[PDB]
Amino acid sequence: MGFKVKLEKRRNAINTCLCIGLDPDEKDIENFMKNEKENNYNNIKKNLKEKYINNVSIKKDILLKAPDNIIRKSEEFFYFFNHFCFYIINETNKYALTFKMNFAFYIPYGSVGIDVLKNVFDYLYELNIPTILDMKINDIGNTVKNYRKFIFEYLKSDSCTVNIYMGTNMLKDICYDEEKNKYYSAFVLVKTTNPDSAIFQKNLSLDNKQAYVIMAQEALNMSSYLNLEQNNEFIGFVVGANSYDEMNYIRTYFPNCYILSPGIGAQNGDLHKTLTNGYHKSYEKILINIGRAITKNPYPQKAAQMYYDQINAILK
């Protein structure tokens, strides 16, 4: 029951390859607190009723207290940050094949944000939903082990994004752990959504080949080593939604490779043929990430539904 397995059954369960993004910023938080207050803590009282919130590991005592009597403190931010996350998850989780949290949004406040991240992952883990920590990690072997522990041991995440520009061997200490054997899954950065994400990814080359291809190439040869596949794990690729051209090629010369693709909502895309279409397969190997487009929309569940039906409205 490695990641590969866990993905497959969630796919049948909901028939969709939608990856909901959970990158809450200071605005979402302070805003969530505002309206929630002038609505008599609607969504939060609704949170407190959900099942798994009872199995939280960090400051459950506080998270479970009634709203108002939290103005009776320095724990306030923590309270609303966490509840906002539980809220979006509760409101959209049934439409998502997986969930991807970007590490960067949980560290700008120090400790407090990691406690939230930790609970967030303990929540999805109980909900038994596939997770992806978008932490685009990278460093030397020795150091990398630390990212591996945090991600796969502490947060019990199912996968994480990785940047191998520094070298492919680094994966040896990210997707594998000798001491316990254990094999983990990761997504390498191939084609990113940065407007200028071509200066190095397209403009750089080797044997007429564009860097992103050599990079995808290597990433795989490393997967063969470690025999992740044999252990139901894999090393997929992050392919920007607006890289139609490049998207189709990866899918072709890498038939059964797992692809993660962000960029349609808040970065202007074309769902139809911005993935899914370009880069089809028994999907799930083509994850469509949408975050801000959903997390900032005033009717999250609605927005979610919308993209769900929409994405699914593509049976070819």
- To which residue do tokens 């070819």 refer? 316
Dist CA 126 CA 286 (whole Å): 24
- Residue 109: name its binding partner from a copy of itself, ligand U5P, none (Cβ under 5 to 8 Å by kind): a copy of itself
Decide: is 224 part of the binding site for a copy of itself (CB under 8 A): no
Q: Is the Cβ–Cβ distance between 130 and 3 less than 8 Å?
A: yes
Name 39's Cβ contacts closer than 8 Å, sequence gap at least 6. Answer: none
Question: Per-residue b/e over 179-213, b at no fewer than 16 CB within 10 Å?
Answer: eeeebbbbbbbbbbbeeebbeebbeeeeeeebbbb
Decide: is 75 part of the binding site for a copy of itself (CB under 8 A): no
Helical H segments across 225-284, by residue range: 244-253
**For residue 21, what is the enclosing H or E element?**
strand 18-21
291 is in an annotated binding site: yes
Collapse the DSSP code of 288 into the 3-class scheme (helix H, G, I; strand E, B; otherwise coil) and give the result: strand
Decide: is 118 part of the binding site for a copy of itself (CB under 8 A): yes
Number of residues that bind ligand U5P (CB under 6 A): 21
Considering only residues 78-117, where is the footprint of ligand U5P by CB under 6 A? 102
Dist CA 290 CA 19 (whole Å): 6
Decide: is 132 part of the binding site for a copy of itself (CB under 8 A): no
- What string marks each residue from 31 to 70 as x (binds ligand U5P by CB under 6 A) or -? ----------------------------------------
68 is in an annotated binding site: no
Q: Is the Cβ–Cβ distance between 157 and 200 less than 8 Å?
A: no
- Residue 293: name its binding partner from ligand U5P, a copy of itself, none (Cβ under 5 to 8 Å by kind): ligand U5P
Taking the least distance from each CB to a copy of itself, the nearer of 39 and 194 is 194
- To which residue do tokens 């059964």 refer? 256
Decide: is 58 part of the binding site for a copy of itself (CB under 8 A): yes
- Residue 225: name its binding partner from ligand U5P, a copy of itself, none (Cβ under 5 to 8 Å by kind): none
- What string marks each residue from 148 to 187 as x (binds a copy of itself by CB under 8 A) or -? -xx--xx--------xxxxxxxx-----------------
Smallest distance from the beta carbon of 54 to ligand U5P, in angstroms? 29
The pair of three-digit structure tokens given for residue 24, joined into one six-digit string: 């809450």
